[PDB]
């Protein structure tokens, strides 16, 4: 369950937050495939309750009402078409699995659902699954309010209701079997793995129970007994009863310590210096690399009050954002996930964005298609960070240096740093307020390389900065602190 199952050589996945199935299918063929992306993490493909107040927030999709593959992203055959078309071009699909809960206990009764299924939250009624009141924990919780009141007690965070969400009784075989049925159908459709949403709120044992019921991957694209990729969402920044190391037995885990620590470093807050990133990795208190799923930001914390507060960098902070994403991508620690989001009107009142609920680009609830401009950027308010040359080329960079050891670290004692990945790639950063001028050993074979951050190798030419490494592997680097993108990168396949 630890292996990503991506096509050999592909080392990252992108979160196409709220994209429609028809757009992802196309995106797979027109771009993800050609650009070496390993796979896509899609938003919950199961039916959820419809929220009109606020008007269709993104989070309504974390309130399941059934497991019918029917949502604002698309129907089941659209979903199927997408999995077939992405796999056929070497791009895996990973489903966001919301299995710890159904919708909010205080929702109205009726069919106000993405697929018209009926449900009565008040009575724990979900005929379309079907689930009854005895399929929920209600009695098992011991807090007075029935909700989570203290994260210092593992029992209530796993047996009580997260923000009113009807907590599913995952200890019951009936429940585990029903969830496995949903995930297995997905597997049979072609899905390569899952993100286990809100793992923190479930017992590791119940997870295991469900996981062990899962089928092997679809032999149409994978070899025989291939196990699905499992990466559990556990927000562990320390200071709590629950720790991520408790779920290592089920698969990998989201290391939120990563994005928090890196954001601070790159932002140069609290006296942090990039030169301190020499021992980046487990050394910094992080979980074991082969258990980590890393990212700079996620759909949740990029909205601020998530895991990491304002230290988390996002596309709003473009310049610095690209440097962090680039450092993570060049560095060997963990398995990387890049974020691809959508724009919305932020409105911070007393330190909190009260518009952070706003859902994906839409025309009266109907999600907008993702339009591609000739310059390869996206339209209709989709940010498409996964298409910024700076990030796109670094995903290629990671693919190219795969398996190569961290090497040739250099730093100017302040905020200028650089390192290599064996003899296949080198990267330099200038995060100081002054010019960077140095002759560094790149570990790369002599030659002329295209800087993949300022340009691209097209035909027999570079569109941007050219770096010349002499026979002895050294090269002169010059980056003004005022450069558009204060870091250069070159690799085996960017060599002219």
């Amino acid at each position: 369950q630890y292996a990503p199952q991506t096509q050999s050589g592909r080392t990252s996945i992108v979160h196409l937050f709220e994209w429609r199935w028809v757009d992802i299918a196309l995106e797979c063929e027109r771009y993800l495939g050609p650009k070496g992306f390993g796979g896509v993490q899609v938003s919950p493909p199961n039916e959820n309750i419809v929220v009109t107040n606020p008007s269709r927030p993104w989070w309504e999709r974390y309130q399941p009402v059934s497991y019918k593959l029917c949502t604002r992203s698309g129907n089941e055959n659209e979903f199927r078409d997408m999995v077939t078309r992405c796999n056929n071009v070497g791009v895996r699909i990973y489903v966001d699995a919301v299995i710890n809960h159904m919708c909010g206990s205080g929702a109205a009764a009726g069919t106000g659902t993405t697929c018209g299924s009926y449900c009565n939250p008040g009575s724990r009624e979900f005929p379309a699954v079907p689930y009854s009141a005895w399929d929920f924990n209600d009695g098992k919780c011991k807090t007075a309010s029935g909700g989570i009141e203290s994260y210092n007690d593992p029992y209530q965070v796993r047996d009580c209701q997260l923000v009113g969400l009807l907590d599913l009784a995952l200890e019951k075989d009936y429940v585990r079997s029903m969830i496995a049925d949903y995930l297995n159908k997905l597997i049979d459709i072609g899905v390569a793995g899952f993100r286990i949403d809100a793992s923190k709120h479930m017992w590791p044992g119940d997870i295991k129970a469900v996981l062990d019921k899962l089928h092997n991957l679809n032999t149409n694209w994978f070899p025989a007994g291939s196990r699905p990729f499992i990466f559990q969402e556990v927000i562990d920044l320390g200071g709590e009863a629950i720790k991520s190391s408790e779920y290592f037995g089920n698969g990998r885990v989201t290391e939120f310590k990563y994005g928090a620590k890196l954001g601070t470093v790159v932002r140069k807050w609290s006296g942090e210096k990039m030169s301190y990133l020499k021992n980046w990795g487990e050394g910094w208190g992080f979980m074991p690399s082969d258990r980590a799923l890393v990212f700079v930001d996620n759909h949740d914390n990029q909205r601020g009050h998530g895991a990491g507060g304002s230290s988390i960098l996002t596309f709003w902070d473009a310049r610095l954002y690209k440097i962090a994403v680039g450092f993570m991508l060049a560095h060997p620690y963990g398995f990387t996930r890049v974020m691809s989001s959508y724009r919305w009107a932020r409105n911070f009142v007393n330190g909190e964005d009260v518009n952070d609920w706003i859902g994906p680009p839409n025309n009266n609830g109907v999600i907008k298609e993702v339009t591609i401009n000739a310059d390869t950027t996206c339209g209709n308010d989709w940010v498409c960070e996964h298409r910024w040359r700076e990030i796109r080329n670094m995903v290629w960079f990671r693919n190219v240096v795969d398996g190569q050891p961290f090497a040739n670290w250099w730093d100017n004692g302040s905020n200028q740093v650089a390192f290599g990945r064996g003899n296949r790639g080198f990267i330099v950063f200038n995060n100081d307020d002054w010019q960077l001028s140095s002759t560094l050993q790149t570990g790369l074979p002599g030659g002329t390389y295209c800087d993949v951050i300022s340009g691209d190798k097209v035909g027999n030419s570079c569109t941007g900065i050219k770096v010349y490494v002499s026979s002895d592997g050294t090269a002169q680097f010059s980056i003004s602190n005022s450069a558009e993108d204060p870091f250069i990168a070159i690799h085996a396949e960017s060599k002219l």
Partner: nanobody, 123 residues
């Protein structure tokens, strides 16, 4: 419940020395550091010691301060030699896995999760 109690501190003349101590009742297998907050100034990381023993040092203290741990008593240490009046500020002991924050004087310090009450140093 973890509690980080810092010791040492006080006033001293320029060029003098001070040794700060931090006790913890949390073990010591993750990074522990020392931050300092001067009046009206941003919070700054002074020195950090990683599990393996390697350390980070603010360029302005490098060669003048020496961070260390004991393990045999769960105590971290920060020896401050050749003190300078610029070193005047409140020093906070900081430790733990993951990350946390310290909200002081309207400013927040992103760091190690657990902080100490802060000891006053004056040069």
């Amino acid at each position: 419940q973890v509690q980080l109690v810092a010791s040492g501190g006080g006033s001293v003349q320029a060029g003098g020395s001070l040794r700060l101590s931090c006790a913890a009742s949390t073990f010591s297998s993750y990074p522990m550091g020392w931050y300092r907050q001067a009046p009206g100034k941003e919070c700054e990381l002074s020195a950090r010691i990683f599990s393996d023993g390697s350390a980070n040092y603010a360029d302005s203290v490098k060669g003048r301060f020496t961070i260390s741990r004991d393990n045999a008593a769960n105590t971290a240490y920060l020896q401050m030699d050749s003190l300078k009046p610029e070193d005047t500020a409140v020093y906070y002991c900081a430790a733990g896995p993951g990350s946390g924050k310290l909200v002081v004087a309207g400013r927040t310090c992103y760091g190690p999760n657990y902080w100490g009450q802060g000891t006053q140093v004056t040069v």
